[PDB]
Write a protein that binds this DNA or RNA. Structure first.
Ligand SMILES: Nc1ccn([C@H]2C[C@H](O)[C@@H](COP(=O)(O)OP(=O)(O)OP(=O)(O)O)O2)c(=O)n1
Ligand SMILES: [Ca+2]
Ligand SMILES: [Ca+2]
Ligand SMILES: [Ca+2]
Ligand SMILES: [Ca+2]
Ligand SMILES: [Ca+2]
Length: 901
DNA sequence: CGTGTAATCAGTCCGCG
DNA sequence: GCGGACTGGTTAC
């Protein structure tokens, strides 16, 4: 096989590299890598190296890496550009793996671990590590085994061995329901004392050294705790054994408000799953506890125990250990679904970066672009310092707040990256500037044609047309990968709707699910078989279809995030290719394209309807238009349609056969007007929305910018078995809105869009009647909690104290005295509840850590003093009033003359 | 910690005769 | 009470 690296480090003048050799063996080598850097040289000097602008460079080879670094400093002291890859490990990878890397994940050791630590005096600080480590479960991907390290004897209690037999039993048998599929995979090792546990752990670590290290909060908790505990007990040199090259560094992570310490393990790639999840999931959660995310992702029940975790080991060590093992499995279960490790490896190896750099789109693109230029003997510029400057973004059209019955939406495929490709925007393709008219003049096509030589953006920039820039070239590569995966995602999604349809009429039989590839549209033969299958088999097929769709979504959306990240990177000061002329070329061209095409679409539709001056485009944001289709429907007349699906076909065919051609002509002209390199403005139909045929549903409504709801029957070619709500920006979509409130508001909206005014009045009335029965957590607001100390003046609110911060301050006073009661963590999320006047907490709200039950000490009082009325008004009634007034509907029945009877 | 800007909204403080 | 200036936080794209 072709070789690939696992990890790379610079340590002094050596590169340390762990790799898979041509035989599939893990090896390690120390290489005295001699780096090259570059200086501009005279034209008279013969060379094959040129900077990106075609200026000649001389290569400077250095005895070692420290010399290369000192050279960079001296070139600054002289005031001359020092060109080339200054991150030597990236240059080393570029020299050592000069081909498209094909990696084999089966050869990569992926470790997944979690530790337990009993503490009586509150949260156990990683930096102190003053309490014994009393359990470690460490899953190894190569062995496919859970290794369990269990402390039987501790200053906090002596216990019996854990029982695998009780662990396997149902909760109802007194067992812990450790899943049967991992029971045979557990290797359990009890220890008489912490020193031997930890020494054996380290010996084990050396035999099975993680390449990828993951878990839940491993970077912020487990790794620093293990490192610091071993350090405290045995000394530094022993703790550094966690690094295969025996090097570690305390790294200080700085944010706006403060700082925290992590331990960098040279020769390991830490991908903490909570951070993988945050970057790649595209969710915002009310809580990031493993229980919470596990429930959301997998639909598994919370791990239930009696009393605090501080007492669980001594009260119930059996369950203590079992829950430690299950915690590790849960991360694996989420990964099997979401496939974030897979994604990380794909992107890391494509970029030829340390795998943990996937967290940084800047570092990712710097490496991609560097390797691309290197292929042509081109030399990258030195990084420069820049002051942070604001710059303009997208255009958002102000909508008339209203109901909107029939809507068709269109938006650009991969808008910003298509803009880069069409205009040819790149650091080295800048050809000059032209004199800019007001944007409006370009929008209406009255401005002078910017150039007859170069490809232009309405911000004033001109670009070469003779060759593609490295940025267009490389962005196109990831775009194509994205497109392939999105294709698989959409097929799996359409296949899911076939299964849902067939579930309406399931067969009374015993059979098995069909073995198929859900990434490809089902053939007719597959469709026939499905029509004959049992509900059990169909449901399994649906689950599989949905896992396939999830797999495609991860792969597509994060490639989309990556290429969109490059347009953004051009406006970040730390990016080697930062240039506000290019960033602004993208956003300004975007503003033009949207408003240009609104004009074109209005002109087209007025033409087919024989009107003038009528606004068919009601809304738009960045690269999207929302077209009112009432008039298209009315021209044939509602009476002519057999059912809902009949008008949906009509609109689908109208959008595809009439509007998309007109949209294309409109953008082709604009491409010519800007003299761009290549027409890439592709505005495909997104949604077809409307009320159910013959219903009183309003179809859709806008309250304002970025705030709307639509009843969608067809989405990007997927025809739903059941209509699906597309709700953006409204309270149903915000993690801050109470769970039960999101649910209730969603149902109000469903009823408005699908059923009408009366149905909405029916539901509202019931919700108002019954809401006080709702579990308190379901009706608590959620907020992030920053700067708690800044507003803390002797335990009470300082000036301008935020509501949720007041909540926390109230909480702190209530739980004073207790080291035991959960502390709110700065920067994390809290649940928030209003309190009735005259409550014993002496304030108007209370907040406590999110994803948790509030401590038993004060729970009963909170429930008794909860202000349901204020809660109702602020989270439900006010947003609903917003929706209804926009839609010109009433949530409460108005008096009529008929009331006289 | 980790690419960008536009936008609504909750809440505090305080004006507004 | 409603708005503006302002702080905080969260979403659309
Ligand atoms: N997280 C995001 C999403 C959007 N955008 C910018 C770049 C996008 O190109 C543009 C339009 O947003 P879309 O959500 O429609 O994304 P794309 O057009 O890129 O992809 P798609 O083909 O899925 O529509 O807005 C961004 O900067 N970052
Ligand atoms: Ca745990
Ligand atoms: Ca788009
Ligand atoms: Ca599309
Ligand atoms: Ca059937
Ligand atoms: Ca869009």
């Amino acid at each position: 096989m072709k070789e690939f690296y696992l990890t790379v480090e610079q340590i002094g003048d050596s590169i340390f590299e762990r790799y898979i050799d041509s035989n599939g063996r893990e090896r390690t080598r120390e290489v005295e890598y001699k780096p090259s850097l570059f200086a501009h040289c005279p034209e008279s000097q013969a060379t094959k190296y040129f900077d990106i602008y075609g200026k000649p460079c001389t290569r400077k080879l250095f005895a070692n890496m420290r010399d290369a670094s000192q050279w960079i400093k001296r070139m600054e002291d002289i005031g001359l550009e020092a060109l080339g890859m200054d991150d030597f490990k990236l240059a080393y990878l570029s020299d050592t793996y000069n081909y498209e890397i094909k990696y084999d994940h089966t050869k990569i050791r992926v470790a997944n671990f979690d530790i337990e630590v009993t503490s009586p005096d509150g949260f156990p600080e990683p930096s102190q590590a003053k309490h014994p480590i009393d359990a470690i479960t460490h899953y190894d991907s190569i062995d496919d085994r859970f290794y369990v390290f269990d402390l039987l004897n501790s200053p906090y209690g002596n216990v019996e061995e854990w029982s695998i037999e009780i662990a396997a039993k149902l909760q109802e048998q007194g067992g812990d329901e450790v899943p049967s599929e991992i029971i045979d995979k557990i290797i359990y090792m009890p220890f008489d004392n912490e020193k031997e546990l930890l020494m054996e752990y380290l010996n084990f670590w050396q035999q099975k050294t993680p390449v990828i290290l993951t878990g839940w909060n491993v970077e912020s908790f487990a790794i620093p705790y293990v490192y610091n505990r071993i350090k405290n007990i045995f000394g530094e040199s022993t703790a550094k054994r966690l690094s295969p090259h025996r090097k570690t560094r305390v790294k200080v992570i700085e944010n706006m408000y403060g700082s925290r310490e992590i331990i960098t393990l040279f020769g390991i790639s830490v991908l903490d799953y909570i951070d993988l999840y945050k970057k790649f999931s595209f969710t915002n959660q009310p809580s990031y506890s493993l229980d919470y995310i596990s429930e959301f992702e997998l639909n598994v029940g919370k791990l239930k125990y009696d009393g605090p975790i501080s007492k669980l080991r001594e009260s119930n060590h059996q369950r203590y250990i079992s829950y430690n093992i299950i915690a590790v499995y849960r991360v694996l279960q989420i990964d099997a679904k979401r496939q974030f490790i897979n994604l990380s490896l794909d992107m890391g190896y494509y970029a030829k970066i340390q795998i943990q750099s996937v967290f940084s789109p800047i570092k990712t693109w710097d490496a991609i672009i560097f390797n691309s230029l290197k292929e042509q003997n081109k030399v990258i510029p030195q990084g420069r310092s820049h002051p942070v400057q604001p710059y303009p973004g997208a255009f958002v059209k102000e909508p008339i707040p209203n109901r909107y019955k029939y809507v068709m939406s269109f938006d650009l495929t991969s808008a910003y990256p298509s803009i880069i490709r069409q205009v040819n925007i790149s650091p080295e393709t800048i050809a000059g500037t032209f004199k800019v008219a007001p944007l409006h003049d370009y929008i209406n096509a009255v401005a002078e044609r910017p150039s007859d030589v170069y490809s232009c953006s309405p911000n004033g920039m001109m670009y070469y047309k003779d060759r593609d820039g490295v940025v267009p070239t490389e962005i196109t590569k990831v775009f194509n990968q994205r497109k392939e995966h999105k294709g698989y995602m959409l097929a799996a999604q359409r296949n899911g709707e076939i299964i849902k349809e067939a579930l309406h009429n399931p067969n009374l039989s015993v059979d098995e699910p069909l073995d198929v590839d859900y990434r490809f549209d089902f053939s007719d033969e597959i469709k026939e078989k499905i029509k004959k299958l049992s509900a059990k088999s169909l449901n399994e097929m649906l689950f599989r279809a949905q896992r396939t769709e999830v797999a495609g979504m991860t792969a597509q959306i994060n490639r989309k995030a990556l290429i969109n990240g490059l347009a953004g990177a051009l406006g970040n000061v730390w990016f080697r290719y930062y240039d506000l002329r290019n960033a602004t070329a993208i956003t300004t061209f975007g503003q033009m394209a949207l408003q240009w095409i609104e004009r074109k679409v209005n002109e087209y539709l007025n033409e087919v309807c024989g009107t003038e001056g009528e606004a068919f485009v009601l809304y738009g944001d960045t690269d999207s238009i929302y077209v009112s289709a009432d008039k298209i429907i009315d021209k044939v007349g509602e009476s002519k349609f057999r059912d809902t699906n009949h008008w949906v076909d009509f609109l689908d065919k109208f959008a595809r056969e009439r509007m998309e051609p007109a949209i294309d002509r409109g953008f082709r002209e604009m491409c010519e007007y800007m003299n761009n390199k290549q027409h890439l403005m592709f505005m495909d139909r997104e949604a077809i929305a409307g009320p159910p045929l013959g219903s009183k549903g309003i179809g859709g409504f806008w309250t304002g910018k970025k705030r709307y709801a639509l009843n969608v029957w067809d989405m990007e070619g997927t025809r739903y078995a059941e209509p699906k709500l597309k709700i953006m920006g409204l309270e149903t979509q915000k993690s801050s809105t109470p769970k039960a409130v999101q649910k209730a508001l969603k149902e109000c909206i469903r009823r408005m869009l699908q059923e009408g005014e009366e149905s909405l009045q029916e539901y509202f009335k019931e919700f108002e009647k019954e809401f006080r029965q709702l579990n308190y957590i379901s009706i608590a607001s959620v907020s992030s909690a920053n700067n708690i100390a800044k507003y803390d003046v002797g335990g009470f609110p300082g000036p301008k104290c935020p509501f949720h911060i007041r909540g926390i301050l109230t909480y702190n006073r209530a739980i004073k005295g207790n080291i035991d009661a959960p502390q709110v963590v700065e920067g994390e999320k809290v649940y928030v509840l209003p309190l009735r006047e005259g409550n014993p907490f002496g304030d108007k709200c209370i907040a406590w850590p999110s994803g948790t039950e509030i401590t038993d000490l004060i729970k009963d009082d909170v429930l008794h003093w909860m202000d349901y009325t204020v809660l109702l008004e602020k989270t439900f009634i006010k947003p609903l009033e917003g929706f209804t007034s926009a839609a010109k509907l009433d949530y409460e029945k108005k008096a009529s003359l008929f009331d006289m009877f």
